[PDB]
C-alpha cells in the first residue's frame, strides 16, 4: 500500500546499507571472516607484547591457527596485502620449548613450523611469526612487525 | 505469512548491520564515543594548523576536553593506543596567555595543566599537547605529532 | 500503530546510514561522486598487481573520463599527501593507442602533462597521476601506490 512506498524505499535503504557495509568491510578494511571468527590485519609495527595488547584493546587476541583452514586463510590474507610476515598468537615465554597459544590453550598435533623451526636462534626467540607462505617461525619478542588479530563471533 | 517472513528477515538484516557496524567502529576504526560526541585518534604526524584542517575536513575539530570526564576518556584513549602525546584543540594563538578551545570558546575554571604550564617556553609555544597521563602542555605550533579529532553527534 | 512502527524502523535505518556515513568519510577518507566511489590504496605495487588488487575488491584502477572525476582524484591525492599514483590508463597492447582499464577508448578529454605521453625509452605503457592532477606515461614495472574506482551498480 501507500506505506509500501515508504517501506519499499526501506527495502532498498536496508539493501543499500548491506552493500556499502560489505564494501567498507571488504574493499576498505580488508577484513577476513569465517563462520565462527573474524581476522584483521593491523599494519602498525609493534613488539609482541604491544601487539597482543592492541588485539585485546579491540576485543580479541593474536590469531591462533589451530587447524589447516585457519592457517590457509591467514596466509592468503598475508599474501594479498603484500606483507612478508606478521605476529601470531603463539609463544613459549613461560617455558622454553613449550609452545602455547595466546589464550593459554596448549599446542597440539597440528603445526606449520618451517624446516628447522622452532630453533630458538641465539636463545632469544620466544614468539612466533607467520610468513607469506603460511609457515611458522619463532622470533625474538622484541622484534617489531605487523600483526593479525582474531575475534570470536560469540 | 510470506510478508511476515520478509519483515522478519529484514529485521534480522537490520540487526546484523547494527552488529557489524559496531564491530567496525570499535575493533577496526578504534573510535571512542560518548552520548554527545565521537573521538578519533589520527596517527599522522602534522603541525597544529594542518591537524585542525584535517579535523575540519572530516567534519569535526581538534578535541576539546572541557570537563574531567572528557579529559579522562581522551587520556585512556591515548594510553590504550600506546601514545606518549597528541595535539588537542587548545591554543593561545590570537592573544598570549589567553587560551581558547578550537571552537573559539574561552578557557574556563577546569584545566589539566601540568605543573608549571602553560609556560610559553622561549616565548614560542602557542599550541597544546596532551600526554599519556592526561595532563596538558603548551608547545610550539610547528611541532609535528599525532592528533585527536572530536565530532558533535548533532 | 503500524505507521508508528514504520516510522520507528525509519529512524533506526537512518541512524545506521548516518554512522555508516561517518565511517566511510571521516575515518576511511574515501571519495565519492554520484555514480562512483574512489579509494586510495597505500600499498606499493606494479600496474598489473594494482589492477588485480582493485578487481579483487570489486572495482578497477581509477578512470578519469571527465574534468570532475579527475579533479576529485587530484584533491584526494593532495589530501593524502601523495606525489603520484597508478591510474586506469594504458597502451600495452598497441603503442600510442591509450585505453582505460575497462578497455574503453581514449577520447577528447585528457590531462596529459606538457610533453606527455612521450613513451620514454620505449618502455612506458602505463599511466600515473601526479599531485597536480596531470597524467604521465611510465614503465609498467614501476612500483607505486594506486587508486581504485567502484561503480555504484
Ligand atoms: Ca629463549
Ligand atoms: Ca624459545
Ligand atoms: Ca627461528
Ligand atoms: Ca608566544
Ligand atoms: Ca603562548
Ligand atoms: Ca610548555
Ligand atoms: Ca611499449
Ligand atoms: Ca607507450
Ligand atoms: Ca612519460
Ligand atoms: Cl623473545
Residue numbers in the entry:
A (entry chain A), B (entry chain B): 116 to 269
C (entry chain C): 117 to 269
Quote the original article.
It binds to pathogen-associated molecular patterns and activates mannan-binding lectin (MBL)-associated serine proteases (MASPs-1, −2 and −3) to initiate the lectin pathway of complement activation, and stimulate immune and inflammatory processes. CL-K1 is a member of the collectin family of animal lectins with an N-terminal collagen-like domain linked to C-terminal carbohydrate-recognition domains (CRDs) via a helical neck.
The asymmetric unit of each crystal contained two trimers with each CRD bound to three Ca2+. Comparison of the bound and unbound structures reveals no major conformational changes upon carbohydrate recognition. Ca2+ is integral to the structure and function of CL-K1. The three Ca2+ interact with residues primarily from loops towards the top of the CRD.
